[PDB]
């Protein structure tokens, strides 16, 4: 037998961080032909999206 | 008795593993793949598998 060992260090924050973020539109501006949505994706430092 | 394992505001419902929520009652969202399964549970299962 052989077991693959996880990195267990320097790979994940202990900081309370959201795993899955919902972004809701700042502006919508609905019209008869289309339905625009305008988002604002804030990615802080240490976050990679 | 108090240490939740996610415990880092990880999931959209940090305090439980919401396996499914009825979409008819659903208002905020957090349902995935066109059924009552949740975003958190879908992410967990897809990541594990």
């Amino acid at each position: 037998r052989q077991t693959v060992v996880a990195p267990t260090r320097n790979v994940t924050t202990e900081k309370a961080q959201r795993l899955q973020i919902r972004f809701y539109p700042i502006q919508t501006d609905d019209t008869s032909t289309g339905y625009r949505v305008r988002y604002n994706i804030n990615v802080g430092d240490g976050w990679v999206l | 008795t108090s240490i939740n394992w996610p415990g880092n505001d990880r999931l959209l419902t940090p305090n439980m593993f919401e396996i499914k929520r009825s979409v008819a009652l659903d208002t905020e969202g957090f349902t995935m793949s066109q059924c009552d399964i949740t975003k958190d549970w879908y992410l967990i299962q897809m990541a594990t598998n």
């Binding site: 202990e14 900081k15 309370a16 802080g44 | 415990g7 505001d9």
Partner: peptide, 16 residues
């Protein structure tokens, strides 16, 4: 920031 090397009862450490 606080580094808590306690094998029981760490801090939440929300941070930012």
């Amino acid at each position: 920031y606080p580094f808590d090397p306690s094998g029981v009862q760490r801090v939440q450490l929300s941070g930012g």
